[PDB]
């Protein structure tokens, strides 16, 4: 029951582990609506100024709203994320999964608090759904060619 909007490698990846998230969301309560906006680097570059009025890319754009859960629209950009995963040889899937669960994990616990940005709770609670949701994609690690690891 997740809302997908925008465009860019993310939806197809979401639709893959869509139900996966529907589980965590369903667990918590099962009545949330997270609108994700897929936008590339440039797409976000402007989208940023479109509201922030500033010209600068970012990892992921979050929607300013403090309600029960969220029921808002957050924007993500796997362009910059991947760029980091490139050097950090990180799994764009996880890095993306974060922003994915970032919506659920949000209403998953804290409610209009997120004191000091995040806490040890949000960290582990975030890695919980991450590993849980990634538990599926896990069957497809690497996500890259890498003519080495066998």
JSON list of C-alpha atoms in Angstrom, two decimals:
[
{"chain": "A", "resi": 1, "resn": "UNK", "atom": "CA", "xyz": [0.00, 0.00, 0.00]},
{"chain": "A", "resi": 2, "resn": "UNK", "atom": "CA", "xyz": [2.81, 2.36, -0.93]},
{"chain": "A", "resi": 3, "resn": "UNK", "atom": "CA", "xyz": [2.39, 5.26, -3.33]},
{"chain": "A", "resi": 4, "resn": "UNK", "atom": "CA", "xyz": [4.97, 5.52, -6.08]},
{"chain": "A", "resi": 5, "resn": "UNK", "atom": "CA", "xyz": [5.43, 8.78, -7.95]},
{"chain": "A", "resi": 6, "resn": "UNK", "atom": "CA", "xyz": [8.06, 10.47, -10.09]},
{"chain": "A", "resi": 7, "resn": "UNK", "atom": "CA", "xyz": [10.53, 8.62, -12.28]},
{"chain": "A", "resi": 8, "resn": "UNK", "atom": "CA", "xyz": [13.91, 6.94, -11.93]},
{"chain": "A", "resi": 9, "resn": "UNK", "atom": "CA", "xyz": [15.39, 3.60, -10.97]},
{"chain": "A", "resi": 10, "resn": "UNK", "atom": "CA", "xyz": [13.52, 3.03, -7.73]},
{"chain": "A", "resi": 11, "resn": "UNK", "atom": "CA", "xyz": [9.91, 2.17, -8.47]},
{"chain": "A", "resi": 12, "resn": "UNK", "atom": "CA", "xyz": [10.74, -1.07, -10.25]},
{"chain": "A", "resi": 13, "resn": "UNK", "atom": "CA", "xyz": [13.04, -1.83, -7.35]},
{"chain": "A", "resi": 14, "resn": "UNK", "atom": "CA", "xyz": [10.24, -0.92, -4.97]},
{"chain": "A", "resi": 15, "resn": "UNK", "atom": "CA", "xyz": [7.56, -2.95, -6.71]},
{"chain": "A", "resi": 16, "resn": "UNK", "atom": "CA", "xyz": [9.99, -5.79, -6.15]},
{"chain": "A", "resi": 17, "resn": "UNK", "atom": "CA", "xyz": [10.02, -5.46, -2.38]},
{"chain": "A", "resi": 18, "resn": "UNK", "atom": "CA", "xyz": [6.69, -3.67, -2.24]},
{"chain": "A", "resi": 19, "resn": "UNK", "atom": "CA", "xyz": [4.85, -6.36, -0.31]},
{"chain": "A", "resi": 20, "resn": "UNK", "atom": "CA", "xyz": [7.97, -6.62, 1.82]},
{"chain": "A", "resi": 21, "resn": "UNK", "atom": "CA", "xyz": [7.29, -3.13, 3.09]},
{"chain": "A", "resi": 22, "resn": "UNK", "atom": "CA", "xyz": [3.57, -3.82, 3.23]},
{"chain": "A", "resi": 23, "resn": "UNK", "atom": "CA", "xyz": [4.50, -6.29, 5.95]},
{"chain": "A", "resi": 24, "resn": "UNK", "atom": "CA", "xyz": [6.26, -3.84, 8.24]},
{"chain": "A", "resi": 25, "resn": "UNK", "atom": "CA", "xyz": [3.62, -1.22, 7.54]},
{"chain": "A", "resi": 26, "resn": "UNK", "atom": "CA", "xyz": [0.92, -3.82, 8.09]},
{"chain": "A", "resi": 27, "resn": "UNK", "atom": "CA", "xyz": [2.64, -4.93, 11.27]},
{"chain": "A", "resi": 28, "resn": "UNK", "atom": "CA", "xyz": [2.72, -1.47, 12.82]},
{"chain": "A", "resi": 29, "resn": "UNK", "atom": "CA", "xyz": [-0.91, -0.83, 11.94]},
{"chain": "A", "resi": 30, "resn": "UNK", "atom": "CA", "xyz": [-1.58, -1.28, 8.24]},
{"chain": "A", "resi": 31, "resn": "UNK", "atom": "CA", "xyz": [-3.04, 2.06, 7.22]},
{"chain": "A", "resi": 32, "resn": "UNK", "atom": "CA", "xyz": [-0.27, 4.34, 6.01]},
{"chain": "A", "resi": 33, "resn": "UNK", "atom": "CA", "xyz": [0.48, 6.09, 2.74]},
{"chain": "A", "resi": 34, "resn": "UNK", "atom": "CA", "xyz": [4.06, 6.94, 1.84]},
{"chain": "A", "resi": 35, "resn": "UNK", "atom": "CA", "xyz": [4.40, 8.83, -1.42]},
{"chain": "A", "resi": 36, "resn": "UNK", "atom": "CA", "xyz": [7.90, 8.39, -2.82]},
{"chain": "A", "resi": 37, "resn": "UNK", "atom": "CA", "xyz": [9.14, 10.76, -5.49]},
{"chain": "A", "resi": 38, "resn": "UNK", "atom": "CA", "xyz": [11.80, 9.26, -7.73]},
{"chain": "A", "resi": 39, "resn": "UNK", "atom": "CA", "xyz": [14.12, 11.97, -8.98]},
{"chain": "A", "resi": 40, "resn": "UNK", "atom": "CA", "xyz": [17.63, 11.82, -10.38]},
{"chain": "A", "resi": 41, "resn": "UNK", "atom": "CA", "xyz": [20.49, 14.13, -9.47]},
{"chain": "A", "resi": 42, "resn": "UNK", "atom": "CA", "xyz": [19.48, 16.89, -11.85]},
{"chain": "A", "resi": 43, "resn": "UNK", "atom": "CA", "xyz": [15.81, 16.18, -11.28]},
{"chain": "A", "resi": 44, "resn": "UNK", "atom": "CA", "xyz": [16.40, 16.68, -7.57]},
{"chain": "A", "resi": 45, "resn": "UNK", "atom": "CA", "xyz": [18.83, 19.51, -8.22]},
{"chain": "A", "resi": 46, "resn": "UNK", "atom": "CA", "xyz": [15.91, 21.61, -9.36]},
{"chain": "A", "resi": 47, "resn": "UNK", "atom": "CA", "xyz": [13.25, 19.96, -7.23]},
{"chain": "A", "resi": 48, "resn": "UNK", "atom": "CA", "xyz": [15.39, 21.21, -4.37]},
{"chain": "A", "resi": 49, "resn": "UNK", "atom": "CA", "xyz": [15.29, 24.80, -5.56]},
{"chain": "A", "resi": 50, "resn": "UNK", "atom": "CA", "xyz": [11.66, 24.24, -6.48]},
{"chain": "A", "resi": 51, "resn": "UNK", "atom": "CA", "xyz": [11.03, 24.49, -2.76]},
{"chain": "A", "resi": 52, "resn": "UNK", "atom": "CA", "xyz": [14.29, 25.11, -0.95]},
{"chain": "A", "resi": 53, "resn": "UNK", "atom": "CA", "xyz": [15.13, 27.68, -3.59]},
{"chain": "A", "resi": 54, "resn": "UNK", "atom": "CA", "xyz": [18.68, 26.40, -3.39]},
{"chain": "A", "resi": 55, "resn": "UNK", "atom": "CA", "xyz": [20.75, 24.82, -6.13]},
{"chain": "A", "resi": 56, "resn": "UNK", "atom": "CA", "xyz": [22.45, 21.74, -4.71]},
{"chain": "A", "resi": 57, "resn": "UNK", "atom": "CA", "xyz": [21.97, 17.97, -4.88]},
{"chain": "A", "resi": 58, "resn": "UNK", "atom": "CA", "xyz": [21.50, 15.71, -1.87]},
{"chain": "A", "resi": 59, "resn": "UNK", "atom": "CA", "xyz": [21.28, 12.09, -0.79]},
{"chain": "A", "resi": 60, "resn": "UNK", "atom": "CA", "xyz": [17.53, 12.12, -0.25]},
{"chain": "A", "resi": 61, "resn": "UNK", "atom": "CA", "xyz": [14.94, 14.86, 0.05]},
{"chain": "A", "resi": 62, "resn": "UNK", "atom": "CA", "xyz": [12.48, 14.55, 2.91]},
{"chain": "A", "resi": 63, "resn": "UNK", "atom": "CA", "xyz": [9.09, 16.21, 3.20]},
{"chain": "A", "resi": 64, "resn": "UNK", "atom": "CA", "xyz": [8.61, 18.65, 6.09]},
{"chain": "A", "resi": 65, "resn": "UNK", "atom": "CA", "xyz": [5.65, 17.39, 8.08]},
{"chain": "A", "resi": 66, "resn": "UNK", "atom": "CA", "xyz": [5.11, 16.34, 11.68]},
{"chain": "A", "resi": 67, "resn": "UNK", "atom": "CA", "xyz": [1.95, 14.28, 11.98]},
{"chain": "A", "resi": 68, "resn": "UNK", "atom": "CA", "xyz": [0.84, 11.03, 13.58]},
{"chain": "A", "resi": 69, "resn": "UNK", "atom": "CA", "xyz": [2.78, 8.99, 11.04]},
{"chain": "A", "resi": 70, "resn": "UNK", "atom": "CA", "xyz": [3.66, 10.96, 7.93]},
{"chain": "A", "resi": 71, "resn": "UNK", "atom": "CA", "xyz": [1.22, 10.40, 5.10]},
{"chain": "A", "resi": 72, "resn": "UNK", "atom": "CA", "xyz": [3.45, 12.78, 3.17]},
{"chain": "A", "resi": 73, "resn": "UNK", "atom": "CA", "xyz": [5.58, 12.66, 0.04]},
{"chain": "A", "resi": 74, "resn": "UNK", "atom": "CA", "xyz": [9.31, 12.11, 0.28]},
{"chain": "A", "resi": 75, "resn": "UNK", "atom": "CA", "xyz": [11.75, 12.34, -2.61]},
{"chain": "A", "resi": 76, "resn": "UNK", "atom": "CA", "xyz": [14.71, 10.06, -3.20]},
{"chain": "A", "resi": 77, "resn": "UNK", "atom": "CA", "xyz": [17.59, 10.06, -5.66]},
{"chain": "A", "resi": 78, "resn": "UNK", "atom": "CA", "xyz": [19.49, 6.80, -6.18]},
{"chain": "A", "resi": 79, "resn": "UNK", "atom": "CA", "xyz": [21.77, 8.80, -8.44]},
{"chain": "A", "resi": 80, "resn": "UNK", "atom": "CA", "xyz": [23.73, 10.44, -5.64]},
{"chain": "A", "resi": 81, "resn": "UNK", "atom": "CA", "xyz": [23.17, 7.46, -3.38]},
{"chain": "A", "resi": 82, "resn": "UNK", "atom": "CA", "xyz": [24.68, 5.10, -5.92]},
{"chain": "A", "resi": 83, "resn": "UNK", "atom": "CA", "xyz": [27.52, 7.54, -6.48]},
{"chain": "A", "resi": 84, "resn": "UNK", "atom": "CA", "xyz": [28.39, 7.04, -2.83]},
{"chain": "A", "resi": 85, "resn": "UNK", "atom": "CA", "xyz": [27.81, 3.30, -3.01]},
{"chain": "A", "resi": 86, "resn": "UNK", "atom": "CA", "xyz": [30.17, 3.29, -5.97]},
{"chain": "A", "resi": 87, "resn": "UNK", "atom": "CA", "xyz": [33.16, 4.32, -3.90]},
{"chain": "A", "resi": 88, "resn": "UNK", "atom": "CA", "xyz": [31.73, 2.88, -0.71]},
{"chain": "A", "resi": 89, "resn": "UNK", "atom": "CA", "xyz": [31.00, -0.30, -2.63]},
{"chain": "A", "resi": 90, "resn": "UNK", "atom": "CA", "xyz": [27.71, -0.12, -0.77]},
{"chain": "A", "resi": 91, "resn": "UNK", "atom": "CA", "xyz": [24.55, -1.89, -1.86]},
{"chain": "A", "resi": 92, "resn": "UNK", "atom": "CA", "xyz": [22.41, 0.80, -3.44]},
{"chain": "A", "resi": 93, "resn": "UNK", "atom": "CA", "xyz": [19.59, -1.55, -2.50]},
{"chain": "A", "resi": 94, "resn": "UNK", "atom": "CA", "xyz": [20.23, -1.05, 1.20]},
{"chain": "A", "resi": 95, "resn": "UNK", "atom": "CA", "xyz": [21.01, 2.64, 0.87]},
{"chain": "A", "resi": 96, "resn": "UNK", "atom": "CA", "xyz": [17.73, 2.93, -1.00]},
{"chain": "A", "resi": 97, "resn": "UNK", "atom": "CA", "xyz": [15.93, 0.55, 1.32]},
{"chain": "A", "resi": 98, "resn": "UNK", "atom": "CA", "xyz": [16.75, 3.01, 4.08]},
{"chain": "A", "resi": 99, "resn": "UNK", "atom": "CA", "xyz": [14.84, 5.85, 2.46]},
{"chain": "A", "resi": 100, "resn": "UNK", "atom": "CA", "xyz": [12.17, 3.26, 1.75]},
{"chain": "A", "resi": 101, "resn": "UNK", "atom": "CA", "xyz": [11.72, 2.15, 5.34]},
{"chain": "A", "resi": 102, "resn": "UNK", "atom": "CA", "xyz": [12.60, 5.70, 6.31]},
{"chain": "A", "resi": 103, "resn": "UNK", "atom": "CA", "xyz": [8.90, 6.33, 5.84]},
{"chain": "A", "resi": 104, "resn": "UNK", "atom": "CA", "xyz": [7.64, 3.29, 7.72]},
{"chain": "A", "resi": 105, "resn": "UNK", "atom": "CA", "xyz": [10.46, 3.16, 10.24]},
{"chain": "A", "resi": 106, "resn": "UNK", "atom": "CA", "xyz": [9.34, 6.71, 10.95]},
{"chain": "A", "resi": 107, "resn": "UNK", "atom": "CA", "xyz": [5.79, 5.93, 12.01]},
{"chain": "A", "resi": 108, "resn": "UNK", "atom": "CA", "xyz": [7.19, 2.56, 13.04]},
{"chain": "A", "resi": 109, "resn": "UNK", "atom": "CA", "xyz": [8.06, 4.11, 16.38]},
{"chain": "A", "resi": 110, "resn": "UNK", "atom": "CA", "xyz": [8.75, 7.74, 17.21]},
{"chain": "A", "resi": 111, "resn": "UNK", "atom": "CA", "xyz": [5.90, 10.12, 16.47]},
{"chain": "A", "resi": 112, "resn": "UNK", "atom": "CA", "xyz": [6.81, 13.75, 15.88]},
{"chain": "A", "resi": 113, "resn": "UNK", "atom": "CA", "xyz": [10.01, 13.56, 17.90]},
{"chain": "A", "resi": 114, "resn": "UNK", "atom": "CA", "xyz": [13.09, 12.16, 16.20]},
{"chain": "A", "resi": 115, "resn": "UNK", "atom": "CA", "xyz": [15.05, 13.94, 18.90]},
{"chain": "A", "resi": 116, "resn": "UNK", "atom": "CA", "xyz": [18.64, 14.70, 17.98]},
{"chain": "A", "resi": 117, "resn": "UNK", "atom": "CA", "xyz": [17.80, 13.72, 14.42]},
{"chain": "A", "resi": 118, "resn": "UNK", "atom": "CA", "xyz": [17.84, 10.03, 15.26]},
{"chain": "A", "resi": 119, "resn": "UNK", "atom": "CA", "xyz": [18.56, 7.82, 18.24]},
{"chain": "A", "resi": 120, "resn": "UNK", "atom": "CA", "xyz": [20.02, 4.38, 18.86]},
{"chain": "A", "resi": 121, "resn": "UNK", "atom": "CA", "xyz": [16.44, 3.18, 18.66]},
{"chain": "A", "resi": 122, "resn": "UNK", "atom": "CA", "xyz": [15.82, 4.62, 15.21]},
{"chain": "A", "resi": 123, "resn": "UNK", "atom": "CA", "xyz": [19.15, 3.19, 14.13]},
{"chain": "A", "resi": 124, "resn": "UNK", "atom": "CA", "xyz": [18.51, -0.40, 15.16]},
{"chain": "A", "resi": 125, "resn": "UNK", "atom": "CA", "xyz": [14.81, -0.05, 14.42]},
{"chain": "A", "resi": 126, "resn": "UNK", "atom": "CA", "xyz": [15.85, 1.19, 11.00]},
{"chain": "A", "resi": 127, "resn": "UNK", "atom": "CA", "xyz": [18.28, -1.66, 10.44]},
{"chain": "A", "resi": 128, "resn": "UNK", "atom": "CA", "xyz": [15.53, -4.02, 11.55]},
{"chain": "A", "resi": 129, "resn": "UNK", "atom": "CA", "xyz": [13.19, -3.37, 8.66]},
{"chain": "A", "resi": 130, "resn": "UNK", "atom": "CA", "xyz": [16.18, -2.78, 6.41]},
{"chain": "A", "resi": 131, "resn": "UNK", "atom": "CA", "xyz": [17.52, -6.27, 6.96]},
{"chain": "A", "resi": 132, "resn": "UNK", "atom": "CA", "xyz": [13.98, -7.61, 7.07]},
{"chain": "A", "resi": 133, "resn": "UNK", "atom": "CA", "xyz": [12.96, -5.93, 3.84]},
{"chain": "A", "resi": 134, "resn": "UNK", "atom": "CA", "xyz": [16.40, -6.53, 2.37]},
{"chain": "A", "resi": 135, "resn": "UNK", "atom": "CA", "xyz": [15.92, -10.10, 3.55]},
{"chain": "A", "resi": 136, "resn": "UNK", "atom": "CA", "xyz": [14.43, -10.64, 0.11]},
{"chain": "A", "resi": 137, "resn": "UNK", "atom": "CA", "xyz": [16.82, -8.70, -2.09]},
{"chain": "A", "resi": 138, "resn": "UNK", "atom": "CA", "xyz": [19.40, -10.50, 0.01]},
{"chain": "A", "resi": 139, "resn": "UNK", "atom": "CA", "xyz": [18.94, -13.38, -2.41]},
{"chain": "A", "resi": 140, "resn": "UNK", "atom": "CA", "xyz": [20.42, -10.98, -4.94]},
{"chain": "A", "resi": 141, "resn": "UNK", "atom": "CA", "xyz": [23.48, -9.44, -3.29]},
{"chain": "A", "resi": 142, "resn": "UNK", "atom": "CA", "xyz": [26.19, -7.43, -5.00]},
{"chain": "A", "resi": 143, "resn": "UNK", "atom": "CA", "xyz": [23.69, -6.15, -7.54]},
{"chain": "A", "resi": 144, "resn": "UNK", "atom": "CA", "xyz": [26.70, -5.59, -9.76]},
{"chain": "A", "resi": 145, "resn": "UNK", "atom": "CA", "xyz": [28.95, -7.53, -12.11]},
{"chain": "A", "resi": 146, "resn": "UNK", "atom": "CA", "xyz": [32.27, -7.26, -10.30]},
{"chain": "A", "resi": 147, "resn": "UNK", "atom": "CA", "xyz": [34.35, -9.87, -12.13]},
{"chain": "A", "resi": 148, "resn": "UNK", "atom": "CA", "xyz": [35.87, -11.07, -8.88]},
{"chain": "A", "resi": 149, "resn": "UNK", "atom": "CA", "xyz": [33.75, -12.34, -6.01]},
{"chain": "A", "resi": 150, "resn": "UNK", "atom": "CA", "xyz": [32.36, -15.76, -6.84]}
]
